[PDB]
Amino acid sequence: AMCPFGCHCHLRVVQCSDLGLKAVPKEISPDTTLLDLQNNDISELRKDDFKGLQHLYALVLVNNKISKIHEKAFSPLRKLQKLYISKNHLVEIPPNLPSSLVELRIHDNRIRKVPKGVFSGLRNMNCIEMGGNPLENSGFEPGAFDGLKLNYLRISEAKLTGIPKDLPETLNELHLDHNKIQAIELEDLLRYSKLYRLGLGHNQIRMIENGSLSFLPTLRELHLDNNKLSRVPAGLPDLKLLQVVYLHTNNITKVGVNDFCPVGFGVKRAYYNGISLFNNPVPYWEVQPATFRCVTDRLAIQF
């Protein structure tokens, strides 16, 4: 089967975008590897909508208005690894997705609660966009990300009121930027013991209670800007590899001299490679230079 009317496709790639297609076209070669059918008018996925696309690797469904997805919709998709279904009217993480899947974009939707065994099948995940969704911490559910060894996860722009606890432990990155988070407590970041990044920018963090940032032996970048913070978060010096913390647009008033570098020189340590602080009530002349001894360049200090 060559390709649907508006579409143009070449060598197993099928490009069907901005045609405003009522649903997934019926003429689609099985040879087909990518199906980019973005910004059309699909409102559901039907059992046999994707029938016999077993060689389909990446399906881009973004910018549609999907809202119902038939159970055995994805089941013919044996080799599928990429499923981008951002900016849709989805109302539940779709089930039965292809164990082959490694990336899952599902931003700007309408998912209010993520149940339990939803991700139970996948065993290759590692990327998961779920922001732009309206979920409150009470929407997650005991063992939602149960058995799911994945390294990236972003739940930005949602209705998070505090950092979730039962996420994947394997997580190498964790984002939660753009929420309504209240404050990072002691055992929040507990089990996330392998993180490189940790965005919490644009939140409402008022009081990060010390030692909580301790369980992140390897944390490398910490964005903690645009909050309601009042002093530099306690634990910063003890983080052997924190190379860029981000604190601008907070409500830091005072900057202790040992608020970043540690008291007695080490080497397990790393020199900061970026520190933000501008746009905080505390002028340049209130913070002794001795304060940024272990940063490298001057240029590393937005201030």
Ligand X SMILES: *[C@@H]1O[C@H](CO)[C@@H](O)[C@H](O)[C@H]1NC(C)=O
Query: Which residues contact ligand X by CB under 6 A?
Result: 206, 228, 230, 251, 253
**For tokens 């007695």, what's the residue?**
264
Q: Please, which of residues 255-284 interact with a second copy by CB under 8 A?
A: none
Which partner from the list a second copy, ligand X, none does 237 bind, CB cut-off 5 to 8 Å by kind? none
5 to each of 25, 56, 88, how far by Cα in Å? 9, 20, 23
The residue written with tokens 């997580």 in the block is 171
- Total residues binding a second copy (CB under 8 A): 31
- State yes or no: residue 105 binds a second copy (CB under 8 A): yes
d(C-alpha 297, C-alpha 71), whole Å: 56
Q: Which is nearer to a second copy, 195 or 255 (CB)?
A: 195
Sole residue written with tokens 């044996």: 78
Of 114 and 232, which CB lies nearer to ligand X in the complex structure? 232
In sequence order, the 6+-apart residues with CB closer than 8 A to the CB of 238 are: 214, 262
Q: How far is the CB of 293 from a second copy (least distance, A)?
A: 25
Check residue 177 for interaction with a second copy (CB under 8 A): yes
Stretch that binds a second copy, among 11-19, 137-145, 247-255, 262-270 (CB under 8 A): 11-19
With binding defined as CB under 8 A, does residue 173 bind a second copy? yes
Q: What is the C-alpha to C-alpha distance for residues 215 and 166, in angstroms, rounded to an integer? A: 15
Read off the tokens for 56: 């389909």
Say whether 292 sits in a helix, a strand or coil. Answer: helix
Q: Which of 125, 64, 133 is nearest to 93 (CA)?
A: 133
Say how far apart CA 224 and CA 202 lie, in whole Å: 8
Question: Residue 175 interacts with a second copy (CB under 8 A)?
Answer: yes
Residue 127's binding partner, choosing from ligand X, a second copy, none, with beta-carbon cut-off 5 to 8 A by kind?
Answer: a second copy
Give, as ranges, the residues between 192 and 211 that touch a second copy (CB under 8 A).
197, 199
- Under DSSP, the state recorded for 44 is E
Q: Which residue is nearest to ligand X (CB)?
A: 251
**Contact status: 50 vs a second copy (CB under 8 A):** no
Angstrom distance (rounded) from CA 136 to CA 277: 30
Contact residues for a second copy, defined by CB under 8 A: 5-6, 8, 10, 15, 17-19, 39, 63, 86-87, 103, 105, 107-108, 126-127, 129, 131-132, 152, 154, 156, 173, 175, 177, 197, 199, 221, 223
